[PDB]
Paper text:
The complex was formed in the presence of the GTP analog 5’-guanylyl imidodiphosphate (GNP). An atomic model of [name]ΔNC was built based on a 3.6 Å resolution cryo-EM map. Three-dimensional (3D) classification resulted in nine major classes with varying tilt angle, indicative of conformational plasticity. As the structure of one [name] hexamer–[name] monomer complex is identical to the other (see “Methods”), only one of them was analyzed. The [name]ΔN protomers form a ring-like structure, with a pseudo six-fold symmetry. In the hexamer, three consecutive GNP-bound interfaces have a higher buried surface than the GDP-bound interfaces. The asymmetric hexamer and the consecutive arrangement of GNP- and GDP-bound interfaces indicated that hydrolysis of GTP occurs sequentially rather than in concerted or stochastic manner. The stalk’s head plugs the pore of the ring through interactions with loop L1 of all the six [name]ΔN protomers. The [name] helix bundle interacts with loop L3 (residues 333–343) and the CTD helix H9 of all the [name]ΔN protomers, except F, to varying extent. These interactions change the conformation of L3. Our structure-based mechanism reveals that [name] activates [name] [name] by remodeling its active site.
Numbering used by the authors:
A (entry chain C), E (entry chain B), F (entry chain A): 168 to 457
B (entry chain M): 3 to 21, 28 to 267, 272 to 348
C (entry chain D): 174 to 457
D (entry chain E): 173 to 457
């Protein structure tokens, strides 16, 4: 794998990706936060192959957290074989065992929607260990369900953790400030106003005028939302995903195509973002159309 | 029987709590104003999202969920009927902070004297929160929430909910409620006013340093080092800047609202704070008396016992922004 | 495509959106035939009236990921990992890729959709369908064994707009699902043609639409408390007339007290007089 | 059965008209209204053949769950076996006889979480989704060989009561799947007055009491918020003690007022004994 | 091993470390409460070498509380064997038995993030026995899952317990005042002002001007943090761990390096910290960058 | 066991110990209700030896309640073998059996931290017999797990039950119903203003004036807490056990020793108590230092 292979279709600036990989080699843990629809899940698998430099899926594990996730499933816990219960090495514990076999090659763990599950409960012992200065046998810790003090679990140096956390919902956020320190937080923007996004549209038999019209439209819409940080922070601002996908058939992006998506997707969304103002909904919806 | 226009009171409470358009509402009375805040405040939260706190649950279920508690499992023999005692983390909006909002909404609904539109929206919201459990509110509940895990926004509505709960009295019917006549009583109005200024000063007077200062008598007693019998003395506010120190004592009296004899009993407290307070910096020592009046504001200055003291008033009921100018204008004069 | 009371354009919108996006939510009041639409609609898309492909479930507040996808539940011998319906269903479509298998989710609004779907909240998206996008599930013993949504599966979600819940709003899930409103369809002739081909009076049908629409507009007047989503559905009229009892003012009176009157209470809570007016208006 | 029931005949016919078509129904009324006695005779009235076997009765409570109701695992002598519940056993019983109507009585339905108890089946009991087409495999049915479907013949009657002010707004689950019918106490009705004239009651004693309770029922229901229409007292207390063999008398009422109505009045108000004293006194005379 | 060896690199004053040993040796159980990034974990492993006076790992045991610890895990619980359950002596019970093997040499048990778990449940019987007075055979007590034949468990005198409670997450705070009497609370400050932090920066090819600038800017921020108590109390104030790390390669400290720190870690931290007005965020980020 | 050994060292008045001994012989179910640091656990071991009149371990048994404590361990229950389930006599069952043999000699059972566990779950059926009037063979009952109804368990009249409850937590406002009926509460004052507390300090090389100054401050401080009811009740107030400890070496009392104690015990305790008013913390801390 190579760096340039990824960047062809990527809307995010390279400056950010170099910033991402710079931290990730340093901190060994990062969290990518942006609105829904900006390629967090998309980049993250790409980023792993850049960081490792080789397209090996065996070394990468990708999981999505949710409410029904606990330390027993993640790391260790007692679970039923059948008639008899057993201690079940969880997925992360197994992944770290794999990393120990091959110290040289970097192993990457990608956690989508990390902000959902109770991280303090899920990681637990790992909450300390995962930090860049605390990896290695010197900081070995016995786990909850370990038979004795001698059985101890230490994160390998090689492991890199990547977290994907949407900021659209304030309810589920990483408020645990101690844990916030372990993860180095890299915001991600929709990146409408970039060359790479336009080349994607322009290559798809698209009007050059319409593209600049569209980018000018959304950039203002995003900034309006970002202004009212009390009501809606910048994290809520609309992503580029609605506009990206749907053209694989070969449909050229005419003004009609934009008008179709807005009614189905953005229109109810704006009603949700602006519950109290019905007029304000009309203004921004009509602005795109006209 | 003159009092402050009710809308202006809400602003003093806001500073009192340390943290909107009221032109729309036509109900002048306080509960109409306050309910519109809460009723709209909850709606602002729901847009971003209400607090969801993982509540652990240890319960008897037909399977493995999270962590099984082996002891409760074998002791109750739950395995035999295909059940385990297992601990898991349900995610609810039923938190203590959230329950309080809902119970207060019932109180707002039950109030006999309230705008009809306001009650209509509130009754909708009470319906819109099915999962949350109604509660019988006491101050003890709010006491537990002083930890402040909740956001800066939640703490505002909870303060509103705290205010309503305390100022709720039964009215015509056993079920319904009637609002307290908050404005009439001096003690709560004064305690608002004293706290209103202290919190007001920290925000606006970025130039000066603002602290409430405990003071100790210059006395010595042959009997006791303690001096418990002597009155406890704590400044209302002290607003110290390098050029001048200043103590203010402010109180709400009904008698002063009358434009005759004048109520200045608070001044007796003030001098003794000036005397017992001794400045290391020795720049200067000044005092200010500020009271609320309705019609107009008059400022006087005095040189009493070697101290520079102000008697002043502010015309609450004028307009809230101009009032902000008037309050800062006063402090500028005397502080300098 | 014949007895449907919904416009042909909207179903034309739906089929294109469904085929392209692969997920949709049909959101409207109760009584607009969301379920009948979805059941009819699935059969159009499959091209055959196959009930085995189509599976319907009705979410409810206690529904959880243990039931839906994976879970530990007891057999006769003891405990085991029991593959829930969606894992079981996605396996079924995985066996036969070419045909289109459909999943209908009723009362979707009630449950905490993130909790139930969980891992598939990412996978369900049309681009993220395939082996490359697989993830190991929560209860999977080994990382190597993973779960991936197949490309053929299409999901249809039925949402009742009459229970707004100010509990959790997720704008990410809204991205996966393309939301389609459904209006009751009183104005549409197709609903009228059904009744006019059931020996209804020409005027009576015209009066009925006038009566209900005046009610519907009142409900949508105050968007904050109530809305277009709350407004009354038509379905109550469909049922109960295939016995042979032709429409009459007496028949409507039965339905109003039987069916519409509770609805009115819930919407116009603690306001009997407003109910009396709109209830009585219908009888006239 | 028609003559014995005290509720208006129009209501009795109305229920069958709703029940036959809708197939799911719930009766909400005050305690002492004969909700259970109504449903049984109404169940027999709907079948027309007075078979108790067809009817099966269940009382809900907060502990009641799917393991009892439908299917569950109970310990054997050693190990454990799947244990079929009431509704699963009941419906399979009706499955043989499609023509024959089978009824199920769910008492105090509002107490339990309908979802938790029924589970999967909660959609299947909605009349639109009934029969072989709407088969769903159940939670504990490990194999897919057999599926559970509630057949068309089954009708579900639920007994709910508006006694308690503690009750909040009814669960959303019920409202969708159930049609709510309110039962009046029925003092005014001729059928109740003809039940006391047959027992040699004085018409003045009869007529006064109908007027006397009605005066209470109006005031208790006059309250907007705490005590509504649902609270108002039922007639069941008046039945018990008359046709066993003991004739009506004024003192017989006095026993009955103290027995049930007097404490009941205290529970609803629970504030002022004087208000209780006046109304209880007026009942006596 | 001795104090001079340990305190070469520690940024904490000598004053506290002696204060720590004053309370610890008399009281035998302490808690180090400070914000994240102040070396609470760092010192605690080092303290173990001081009190024993020697670097042996066996006399030390380190664990972390993950809000899933229970009495079954810590002291006594039932664990599955192949077909049937057995009683397993927990980690602390295993440790105390080692501790009484030799009373002369002191034994340390270190519990990170003690604040999280419901401590009343975990310790249980030990909550009485941990205290300095209530140690030794005189206060022998029978445990819950003890054998029918009387066997009693007493915390030996030699054992010392050290806890590491961060003060950022307010909810996770010890409000069991019966329990808070067993432990002694030693606040640990951020450590900016001290020269011993500064000397660490200077030695790594750093200008003293920037170093003195850095501490000046940070201390201004922490006062703004410390002044509030409603949401951001004294405890939230920013730790020094961010600046410590990442300079091992030879990266000299400069505003270019500081710029990476502030944009990436601190600036997210601040916006979550305040989350009322963006202007306050823009102020403090620019102050550090300026 | 002569009273002379017992009662001098104790700070609690000889008046109140008499009252305690009255109710205990009369009612046999007694609860000492006081804040942490007032010697609840300290007296109870002594009181048992007072009543028996001798120092014998056999006649006295001590346990601490916690949430895991249950009937199946306390009284009777089934414990797994490698496979089988064997019934096992619990503590109270085994202890009373000892008491049956010697009816004349008084027997004591000491139950610390009783509020933590629900009594009903633990005692269960035995709360019926445990009451003072319902003792002796006439009221015998067959237990829940008894193989046959013939086997019966009655709490003999000789045993007296002592329960140590601390009113230091907000939850205890809803006191358990089970405790009040069957146990008789006794309140323990903190007891700064006591002659014996002073005499303990005076013998340990303490100035008389310094000691009395301290009592005036603490009595003033505790009085401040007693005024509140919403946040801090009377039971929250400071105990007298911080000051007793730490003088065993011979280190003389002084403001220096007090200064460590305030900084490491009472200052953070006040931070927890008075979160809402930070200055209120400062008001006392300097006052206590004074
Ligand atoms: N082809 C292409 N698609 C992109 C690009 N950037 C983002 N997308 C698309 O947008 C969709 C979502 O990516 P994703 O990371 O999951 O967005 P998200 O913010 O993580 N969503 P969520 O937060 O809800 O998980 C995919 O279709 C993804 O491929 C891009 O540069 N090229
Ligand atoms: N070299 C060196 N590193 C220090 C010093 N003080 C703190 N650190 C470093 O800062 C980082 C974190 O310290 P740590 O003890 O974990 O802080 P913490 O409070 O335990 N962290 P948390 O609250 O998140 O659990 C480590 O790299 C630690 O070694 C020091 O004096 N010298
Ligand atoms: N010498 C002496 N020590 C006392 C006296 N009163 C209390 N103490 C000491 O205070 C320390 C703790 O007493 P303790 O009874 O455990 O307090 P507690 O109420 O049990 N604590 P908690 O409520 O948290 O369980 C012991 O050293 C105890 O002896 C006393 O009068 N004299
Ligand atoms: N012919 C026809 N029948 C309909 C239509 N809409 C609903 N029905 C019938 O109305 C009955 C109830 O539909 P239901 O799914 O419960 O309503 P919904 O879920 O709220 O949409 C079923 O018989 C539906 O098929 C329609 O548009 N046309
Ligand atoms: N004989 C007879 N008894 C009736 C009639 N109506 C109600 N009852 C009696 O009242 C009792 C049932 O009352 P009910 O309200 O259901 O009791 P509840 O369920 O506890 O509220 C039984 O004795 C019924 O037979 C009736 O019309 N005739
Ligand atoms: Mg994603
Ligand atoms: Mg740590
Ligand atoms: Mg104790």
């Amino acid at each position: 794998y190579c760096l340039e292979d990824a960047l062809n279709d990527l809307f995010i600036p390279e400056t950010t990706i170099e910033t991402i990989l710079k931290r990730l080699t340093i901190k060994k843990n990062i969290i990518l936060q942006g609105p829904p629809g900006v390629g967090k899940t998309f980049v993250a698998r790409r980023l792993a192959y850049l960081l490792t430099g080789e397209k090996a899926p065996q070394r990468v594990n990708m999981v999505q957290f949710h409410q029904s996730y606990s330390y027993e499933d993640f790391i260790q816990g007692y679970r039923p074989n059948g008639v008899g219960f057993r201690r079940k090495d969880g997925i992360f514990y197994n992944f770290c065992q794999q990393a120990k076999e091959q110290p040289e090659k970097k192993y990457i763990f990608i956690i989508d929607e990390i902000n959902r599950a109770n991280l303090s409960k899920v990681f637990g012992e790992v909450m300390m260990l995962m930090e860049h200065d605390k990896r290695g046998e010197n900081w070995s810790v016995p786990l909850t369900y370990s038979e004795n003090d001698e059985e101890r679990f230490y994160v390998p140096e090689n492991v890199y953790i990547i977290g994907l956390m949407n900021t659209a919902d304030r309810s589920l956020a990483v408020v645990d400030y101690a844990l916030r320190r372990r993860f180095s937080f890299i915001d991600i923007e929709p990146g409408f106003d970039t060359p790479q996004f336009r080349n994607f549209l322009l290559n798809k038999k698209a009007e050059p005028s319409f593209v600049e019209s569209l980018c000018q439209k959304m950039n203002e819409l995003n900034q309006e939302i970002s202004k009212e940080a009390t009501i809606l922070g910048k994290g809520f601002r609309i992503g580029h995903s609605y506009f990206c996908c749907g053209l694989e058939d070969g449909t050229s992006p005419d003004t009609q195509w934009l008008n179709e998506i807005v009614m189905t997707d953005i229109a109810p969304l704006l009603e949700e973002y602006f519950f109290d103002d019905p007029y304000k909904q009309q203004k921004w919806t009509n602005k795109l159309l006209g | 029987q003159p009092v402050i226009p009710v809308r202006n009171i809400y602003y003093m409470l806001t500073y009192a709590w340390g943290y909107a358009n009221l032109e729309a509402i036509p109900g002048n009375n306080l509960l109409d104003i306050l309910g519109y805040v809460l009723n709209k405040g909850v709606l602002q939260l729901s847009r971003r999202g209400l607090e969801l706190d993982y509540n652990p649950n240890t319960e008897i279920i037909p399977g493995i969920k999270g962590r099984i508690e082996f002891a409760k499992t074998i002791r109750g023999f739950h395995l035999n009927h295909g059940k385990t005692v297992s601990t898991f983390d349900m995610l609810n909006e039923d938190t203590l902070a959230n329950r309080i909002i809902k119970s207060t909404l019932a109180i707002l609904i039950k109030h006999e004297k309230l705008n009809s539109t306001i009650r209509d929206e509130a009754r909708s919201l009470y319906r819109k929160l099915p999962g949350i459990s109604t509660l019988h509110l006491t101050p003890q509940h709010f006491s537990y929430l002083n930890g402040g895990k909740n956001t800066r926004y939640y703490k505002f509505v909870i303060s509103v909910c705290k205010f309503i709960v305390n100022n709720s009295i039964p009215g015509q019917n056993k079920g319904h409620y009637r609002f307290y006549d908050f404005e009439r009583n001096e003690k709560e109005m004064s305690l608002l006013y004293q706290k209103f200024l202290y919190e007001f000063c920290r925000r606006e007077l970025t130039s000066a340093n603002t602290t409430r200062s405990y003071l100790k008598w210059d006395a010595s007693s042959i009997s006791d080092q303690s001096l418990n019998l002597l009155p406890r003395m704590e400044t209302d506010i002290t607003i110290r800047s390098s050029e001048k120190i200043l103590i203010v004592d402010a109180k709400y009296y009904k008698s002063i609202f009358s434009r005759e004899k004048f109520h200045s009993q608070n001044l007796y407290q003030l001098m003794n704070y000036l005397w017992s307070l001794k400045p290391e910096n020795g720049e200067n020592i000044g005092g200010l008396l500020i009271y609320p009046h309705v019609d107009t504001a008059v400022k006087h200055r005095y040189k009493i016992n070697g101290f520079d003291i102000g008697l002043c008033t502010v015309n609450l009921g004028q307009e809230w922004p101009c009032i902000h100018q008037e309050l800062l204008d006063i402090f500028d004069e005397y502080l300098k």
